[PDB]
Amino acid sequence: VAQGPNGRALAESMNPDLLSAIQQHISIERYASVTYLAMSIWCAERELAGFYQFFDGEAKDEQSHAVHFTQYLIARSQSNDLQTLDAPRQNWDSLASLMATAFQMEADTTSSIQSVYALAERNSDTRTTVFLDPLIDAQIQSEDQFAYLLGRVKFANGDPTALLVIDNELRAGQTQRG
Amino acid sequence: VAQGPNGRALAESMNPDLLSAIQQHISIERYASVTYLAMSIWCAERELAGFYQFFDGEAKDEQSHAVHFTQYLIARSQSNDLQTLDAPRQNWDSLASLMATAFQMEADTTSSIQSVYALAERNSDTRTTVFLDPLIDAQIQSEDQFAYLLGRVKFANGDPTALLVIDNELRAGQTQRG
Amino acid sequence: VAQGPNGRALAESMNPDLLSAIQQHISIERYASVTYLAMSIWCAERELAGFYQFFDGEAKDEQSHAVHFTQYLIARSQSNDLQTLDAPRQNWDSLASLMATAFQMEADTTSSIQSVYALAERNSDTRTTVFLDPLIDAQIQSEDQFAYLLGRVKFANGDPTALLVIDNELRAGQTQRG
Amino acid sequence: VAQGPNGRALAESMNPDLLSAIQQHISIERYASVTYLAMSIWCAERELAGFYQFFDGEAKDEQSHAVHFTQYLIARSQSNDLQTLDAPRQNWDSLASLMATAFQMEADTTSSIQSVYALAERNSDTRTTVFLDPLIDAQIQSEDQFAYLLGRVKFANGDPTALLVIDNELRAGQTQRG
Ligand SMILES: [Cl-]
Ligand SMILES: [Cl-]
Ligand SMILES: [Cl-]
Ligand SMILES: [Cl-]
Ligand SMILES: [Cl-]
Ligand SMILES: [Cl-]
Ligand SMILES: [Cl-]
Ligand SMILES: [Cl-]
Ligand SMILES: [Cl-]
Ligand SMILES: [Cl-]
Ligand SMILES: [Cl-]
Ligand SMILES: [Cl-]
Ligand code: NA
């Protein structure tokens, strides 16, 4: 029985380019997490309490997704390499601009997963594509949700009354089309 | 004991013009159903989640009404003839325009029932007028409900804030005067 | 942030040939639904109450599958296009012939999903293959179920006693090998 | 305040031809009741216990329908006139022949109600047509049920095994398409 790079028994070797891509994706999810924290703070500073609570939860959930990936590398007997984390964006001129960045961040997270997926396919790493399948499904739902929140905020057209109504929706947990 | 056109024992023959009118009405209700599905999609595309949920339920209910009619033809030992279904209207410039089409669709459904009713009276088919009586009563309530939703949306006068408030009413199930 | 063809924020553009294939598949599932409705009526006309109840439920379930696809197009910011629905087949000389058509309809539904799947793979649309994976799994179970019902009816070899026994099985909800 | 023919206060006089038609209809329902009793006995004599239980209940229900009509005449301050009751048919060569007579009896009961209904319409007696409306609706369901039982028995094609299976269905209360 062979030993993998992290010292555990190795079921199947992993291509180093694929390993590097997964470690980079962990950084992307950690960066999404701190970005959602920054967004939660921006909303709290403007008394948008429902948006603050929503993004606080998204920050925690994105970190969990990142840790889920570190557990996969452990399971594959591959080394983890936690990287320097860039500072997030922290300034927006409007809630609509913030929500556009949030949607972009979610789509970019999926794009990173897709790039890992394609590299796994090139290397015939079926464990990795199977591992990623439910995470892509969750990203479809998250993209649908962030398009809903962004579209509702854009519909408000900067009216504070409409934004207070949506803020109260989010505080109540009404965050998707349902 | 005589056999009816669908092969079952026949309690009382039905005039072929009346049979054709009932088969056409089934098509009208099936068309109302797919129209409400189209409306649910239009609302979902604009993040009007409460209207999306309302019309999704109306689509399912209208299909049930259609099947209720197919069961009556079975009970009368008459043949069913499921017809080609036209594609629904799918484009509107405003929610107010959509709700006007929805109200028109409900009134047109009643008008079709009324035309069947009058033909049953001409043929002295008391089973059919009795069968239709509670369906007309339900249509009165549905017309009252759709006039309420259309009138509330028109009262909003295109203000997004007002439309978000009404959208949340519908998501909560507040869909009638009560 | 770009806008998709249905107006919502766009996470990733979709190839128009793939979009057309998904819209066509929605029509296939809607056609399966009305076909199962036609089958439910045919069975009801012959007092096969368990088969009537089974196909009535299959009609409702197939419509739900169709709506599930419309929701995916919404989530991908793609336009829906609800199409004209052909009239279903409505006449069979025997229950065994009906069940053969039902099995064929289920296999043809899977074949349509497979064709969408292959087109998604050609375009590297991993969101769509992930979305389709559980629907293919459900189709495997449905094909297994319809092969069971068709095989049991063929085993009956046209004996009315055997068909009454199977009819009572279906009324009781005994519709699979288990 | 005027007194009606039975001595009670009279809300609205009733045409004597209509009164005679209602008294005759009470006899028809009483005759249906004793006919169903005769059928229950015929089935019991042949150990068709489920059919015996079904027709025993139909006999009791038909008598209740008859009494319902006597209560309407009381409510309209009209005289009741309970008539001589003919002896029922009591001999059949097969269960299929019995079920045909049962279906005919149900259709003939509806026909009698229809004749009362038309006479009420000619006399503009809206109380009577309103009273009859739910009874016609129940007759539609009863005709549907008796067509189901007759059709299932005919499907059996005289096979004792099939008739025992249907007999057990009826004993269990499985008496309609559902
Ligand atoms: Cl900005
Ligand atoms: Cl804004
Ligand atoms: Cl940015
Ligand atoms: Cl318009
Ligand atoms: Cl509007
Ligand atoms: Cl229109
Ligand atoms: Cl055939
Ligand atoms: Cl067969
Ligand atoms: Cl076919
Ligand atoms: Cl006889
Ligand atoms: Cl027989
Ligand atoms: Cl007779
Ligand atoms: Na049995």
Author numbering:
A (entry chain A), B (entry chain A), C (entry chain A), D (entry chain A): 5 to 182
Structure paper excerpt:
Ferritins are proteins forming 24meric rhombic dodecahedral cages that play a key role in iron storage and detoxification in all cell types. Their function requires the transport of Fe2+ from the exterior of the protein to buried di-iron catalytic sites, known as ferroxidase centres, where Fe2+ is oxidized to form Fe3+-oxo precursors of the ferritin mineral core. SynFtn, isolated from the cyanobacterium Synechococcus CC9311, is an atypical prokaryotic ferritin that was recently shown to take up Fe2+ via its threefold channels.
Protein structures derived from all crystals harvested without iron enrichment were free of bound metal ions, as expected. The structures of variants E141A and E141D overlay with that reported for the wild-type protein with overall rmsd (for main chain atoms) of 0.10 and 0.11 Å, respectively, with the major difference in structure being associated with the side chain of the substituted residue. This is the case for the metal-free structure of variant E141D, while conformational flexibility at this position is not possible in E141A. In contrast, the rate constant for iron binding to the E141D variant was almost identical to the wild-type protein, at 3.4×105  m −1 s−1, demonstrating that the conservative replacement of Glu by Asp did not have a significant effect on oxidation rate. It appears, therefore, that the charge of the carboxylate group is of greater importance for SynFtn function than the observed conformational flexibility of residue Glu141, despite the altered fractional occupancy of SynFtn iron binding sites induced by the E141D substitution.
